Amino acid sequence: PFFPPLYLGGPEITTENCEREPIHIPGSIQPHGALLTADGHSGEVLQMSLNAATFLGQEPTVLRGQTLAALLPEQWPALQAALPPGCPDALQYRATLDGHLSLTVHRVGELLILEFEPTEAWDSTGPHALRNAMFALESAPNLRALAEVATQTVRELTGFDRVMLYKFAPDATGEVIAEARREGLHAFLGHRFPASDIPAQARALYTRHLLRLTADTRAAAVPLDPVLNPQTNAPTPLGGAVLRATSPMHMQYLRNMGVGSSLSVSVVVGGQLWGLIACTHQTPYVLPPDLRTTLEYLGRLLSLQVQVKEALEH
Numbered sequence: 001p002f003f004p005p006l007y008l009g010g011p012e013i014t015t016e017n018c019e020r021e022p023i024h025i026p027g028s029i030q031p032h033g034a035l036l037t038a039d040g041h042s043g044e045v046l047q048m049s050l051n052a053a054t055f056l057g058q059e060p061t062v063l064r065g066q067t068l069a070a071l072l073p074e075q076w077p078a079l080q081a082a083l084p085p086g087c088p089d090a091l092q093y094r095a096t097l098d099g100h101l102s103l104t105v106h107r108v109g110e111l112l113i114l115e116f117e118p119t120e121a122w123d124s125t126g127p128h129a130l131r132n133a134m135f136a137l138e139s140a141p142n143l144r145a146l147a148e149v150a151t152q153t154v155r156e157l158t159g160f161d162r163v164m165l166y167k168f169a170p171d172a173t174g175e176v177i178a179e180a181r182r183e184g185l186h187a188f189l190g191h192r193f194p195a196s197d198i199p200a201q202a203r204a205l206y207t208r209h210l211l212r213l214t215a216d217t218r219a220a221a222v223p224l225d226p227v228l229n230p231q232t233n234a235p236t237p238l239g240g241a242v243l244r245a246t247s248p249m250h251m252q253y254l255r256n257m258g259v260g261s262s263l264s265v266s267v268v269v270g271g272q273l274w275g276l277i278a279c280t281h282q283t284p285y286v287l288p289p290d291l292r293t294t295l296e297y298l299g300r301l302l303s304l305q306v307q308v309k310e311a312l313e314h
């Protein structure tokens with residue numbers, strides 16, 4: 001059972017209780033974007049990250065109480081049609097706003113969660129970089145070759161320093177079974193890790209929300225305000241927001257591994273967490289938004305191909 005979060009008198013997490021950290025409700029975000037939450041019927045802004053001036057030009061306590069009808073006149077109608085009450089919490093509405101801001105919205109219960117991050121004027125994903133990655137995965141003749149090609153494909157799409165295929169054993173210990181890495185880096189092929197390095201509550205969350213990242217492992221998290229959703233007087237679930245603050249226990253693990261940026265995608269086979277496409281970079285790095293979306297689709301393709309290649313040994 002989860003500890004209360006730190007803003008409800010929970011204790012600070014230590015290695016004795018890592019599996020009890022409520023990582024889905026940190027009440028804070030990463031500083032490379034801004035987050036608002038809004039009521040799903042009125043569009044009233046209920047919660048705002050404290051940095052929302054840096055990306056939206058207006059102050060946190062100034063935005064509170066305004067509506068999305070006023071703030072996003074063009075998207076407010078569309079976002080309502082796209083994310084009705086009761087839709088899946090993994091369903092996303094995406095738009096570009098005009099500099100250019102990527103807007104991502106999802107619905108949790110009666111709450112709309114809006115993430116804003118800067119982006120370049122043009123897509124980073126090549127016209128049909130998606131097609132050649134798909135060809136590469138489909139054409140692999142066996143699971144080993146699939147694993148090799150999936151890591152190299154993802155590395156060529158993303159430019160991450162290290163791209164691993166991280167597979168869970170039946171005892172929940174992990175292993176790097178394939179890797180693509182920058183010239184001069186030492187292989188992590190074949191290295192195994194205890195189950196506690198990706199603890200049970202993290203595995204569970206990764207079964208429902210298929211992509212997460214840490215863009216800067218040294219960057220302080222930005223609080224949301226107020227920290228509790230005023231609808232419920234309870235924590236705002238953030239497991240569907242990529243701007244969610246990362247567990248400090250994992251950020252510290254990454255710092256000690258010389259990692260500035262991390263991103264993974266779940267591989268889900270027969271509804272179970274089979275493994276992760278786990279990416280790392282020596283320097284902080286925000287994977288552009290369009291490239292994330294590509295990478296999420298590829299994880300879904302990879303998952304189907306792994307299930308096929310395993311139906312064959314069986």
Ligand SMILES: *C/C=C1/C(=C/c2[nH]c(/C=C3[NH+]=C(/C=C4\NC(=O)C(C=C)=C4C)C(C)=C\3CCC(=O)O)c(CCC(=O)O)c2C)NC(=O)[C@H]1C
Binds near residue numbers: 018023245276
């Ligand atoms: C007492 C708690 C501990 C702990 C918790 C923890 N770890 C994760 C998430 C991840 N851990 C990962 C591990 C690795 N990344 C690598 O690059 C390597 C080795 C080469 C390992 C072993 C990974 C891949 C994840 C997923 C997230 C990501 O891709 O960056 C969480 C959840 C983090 C979150 O979503 O907020 C938690 C709570 N890790 C420990 O080592 C102990 C100290």
